[PDB]
Amino acid sequence: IVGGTSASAGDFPFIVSISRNGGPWCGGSLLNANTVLTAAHCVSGYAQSGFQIRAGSLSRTSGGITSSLSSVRVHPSYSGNNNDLAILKLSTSIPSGGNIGYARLAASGSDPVAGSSATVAGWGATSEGGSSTPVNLLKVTVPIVSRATCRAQYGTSAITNQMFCAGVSSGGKDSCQGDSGGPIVDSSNTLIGAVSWGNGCARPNYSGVYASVGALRSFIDTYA
Fold first, then answer.
1. Which of 60, 76, 105, 118 has its CA 20 to 30 Å from the CA of residue 6?
2. How many Å apart are CA 119 and CA 101, to the nearest integer?
3. Dist CA 29 CA 88 (whole Å)
4. What is the fold of 1-12+103-214?
5. Domain coordinates of the chain in residue numbers?
6. Which residues are catalytic?
């Protein structure tokens, strides 16, 4: 997270950190006791044994409940940056209680509304190309960017209705490398997307691009 602040305990009860090879890698969202929603790019094709999930902590290294993965299901039509979600099944159940809860999904057919304030969180880089990855969770609030503008920025073909965009025109607030798969929520903390891709991080006029929960609910609902 670029241009963010320290998350507080309980801000995202459902957020998980996803390590790979014992190192920071991605974020995700706990949907229920044995299921995490993350970005397909975080897990597609990779050895599933390299991953570990941690829930119930502001730290990605300590505290909470951990689990290995039983299975990975990438969206059936994942293609390029498109349909960039995967459903993970957990070998250790993660009961709700305390700072653990489950995500509330955006309504089916919904699209985030341009100009509305969204909050994204993760343990990714704090600058584009940055060396340091935060131990404690960061968050940042950015406006949704209209898809028409996002298409002006990246090309019409590059932004589909399975994606939405968020960021500030003059740059400086965004998700970044290591935040992929983690949540973006609306002002009521409803899960509207997962961090997906972008042309660097926090660049002026290149919005962050997010996998859209509202558009992907039929894959999410069926396997969650």
1. 105
2. 17
3. 10
4. Thrombin, subunit H (2.40.10)
5. 1-12+103-214, 13-102+215-223
6. 41, 84, 180
On whether the CB atoms of residues 173 and 2 are closer than 8 A, the answer is yes
Query: Residue 34 CB: number of other CB atoms within 10 A?
Result: 16
Task: Give the number of residues written for the chain.
Answer: 224
Structural tokens at position 89: 């099944």
Resolution (A): 1.2
- How many degrees, rounded to 5, is the angle at CA 220 between CA 214 and CA 222? 125
Topology alike, domains 1-12+103-214 and 13-102+215-223: yes
Distance between CA atoms of 109 and 127, rounded to whole angstroms?
33
Within 10 angstroms of residue 132's Cβ, the number of other Cβ atoms is: 8
Is there a contact between 26 and 42 (Cβ–Cβ < 8 Å)?
A: yes
Residue that has been written with the tokens 């974020």 in this structure? 27
The approach used to solve this structure was X-ray
